[PDB]
Amino acid sequence: MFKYEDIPADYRDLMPPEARDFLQNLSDGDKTVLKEVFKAGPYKNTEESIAALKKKSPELGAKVEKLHAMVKSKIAALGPEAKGFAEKSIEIARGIKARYYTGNEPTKDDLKASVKEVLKLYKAMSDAGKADFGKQFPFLAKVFESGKAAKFAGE
Ligand SMILES: CCCCCCCCCCCCCCCC(=O)O
Ligand SMILES: CCCCCCCCCCCCCCCC(=O)O
């Protein structure tokens, strides 16, 4: 059973507050249902994974759906470069998440390595790409721009 404390506090500080509060709120039952849905995967896409979740839990399914629709609409407003970055960042974050469901949770060095890559991809974008991303994701843009992500990653 995954516990919120399993994630280092300084990595949780890099996550947007809505994502942090979603995870912090999880009951023991919520975590069982998330793990069972993940284990009954893989799925065609995120939407199919959420539909399977809603079947087990209309309430947790609706909570996940609300977060997902907000992220999906923010990505839809991006130009091709910032969309590519956001989608690659999500793929990296999902691989980290997969490790908390399956055996052997990521180490702090594994998390530092994932942030280091996401930051590198952020820095690889043009200024127009960074500005486009920042308009939709101001918390994450600030984590990158302030040096907060670099401090965690170690560099
Ligand atoms: C990241 C916001 C939550 C998104 C919806 C799925 C939540 C269930 C995940 C449980 C395992 C915790 C994973 C922590 C690492 C990470 O979120 O990147
Ligand atoms: C069952 C938990 C999964 C919910 C994850 C919600 C937070 C991440 C949102 C990013 C969506 C990316 C676009 C959809 C791509 C796809 O369907 O493969």
Numbering used by the authors: 0 to 154
Question: What do the authors say?
Answer:
Fatty acid and retinol-binding proteins (FARs) comprise a family of unusual α-helix rich lipid-binding proteins found exclusively in nematodes. They are secreted into host tissues by parasites of plants, animals and humans. The protein Na-FAR-1 derives from the blood feeding intestinal hookworm of humans, N. americanus. The 3D structure of Na-FAR-1 in its ligand-free and ligand-bound forms, determined by NMR (nuclear magnetic resonance) spectroscopy and X-ray crystallography respectively, reveals an α-helical fold similar to Ce-FAR-7, but Na-FAR-1 possesses a larger and more complex internal ligand-binding cavity and an additional C-terminal α-helix.
Na-FAR-1, which had not been subjected to reverse phase HPLC purification to strip out co-purifying ligands, crystallized as previously reported and diffracted to 2.14 Å. Molecular replacement using the Ce-FAR-7 structure proved unsuccessful and we therefore obtained the crystal structure of Na-FAR-1 in complex with co-purifying ligands, hereafter referred to as holo-Na-FAR-1, by anomalous dispersion from crystals of Se-Met-labelled protein. Na-FAR-1 presents a wedge-shaped structure with two larger faces each of approximately 40 by 30 Å in area and of ∼17 Å in width at the wide end of the wedge. The fold is organized into 11 helices of various lengths, defining an internal cavity. The internal cavity is much larger for the holo protein, achieved by a global outward displacement of the surrounding helices by a little over 1 Å compared with the apo form, with the biggest changes seen at the C-terminal end of helix α7. In the holo form, the cavity is more than twice as big, reaching 2570 and 2170 Å3 for probes of 1.4 and 1.925 Å respectively. In the holo structure the expanded cavity is lined by the same residues as in the apo structure, but with 21 additional, predominantly apolar, side chains contributing to the surface of the expanded cavity (Phe1, Ile6, Leu25, Lys30, Lys34, Val36, Ser48, Ile49, Leu52, Met69, Phe84, Ala85, Ile91, Ile95, Tyr99, Leu110, Ser113, Phe132, Phe136, Val142 and Ala148). In addition to the opening seen in the apo form, the cavity is also accessible to solvent via an opening between the α2–α3 and α9–α10 turns and α6. Within the cavity of the holo form, clear electron density was observed that is well fitted by a single FA molecule, containing 16 carbon atoms. The palmitate appears to be curled into a C-shape around the side chain of Lys96 and contacts 11 other residues (Phe1, Ile6, Met14, Phe21, Leu22, Leu25, Leu33, Leu66, Ile95, Tyr99 and Tyr100).
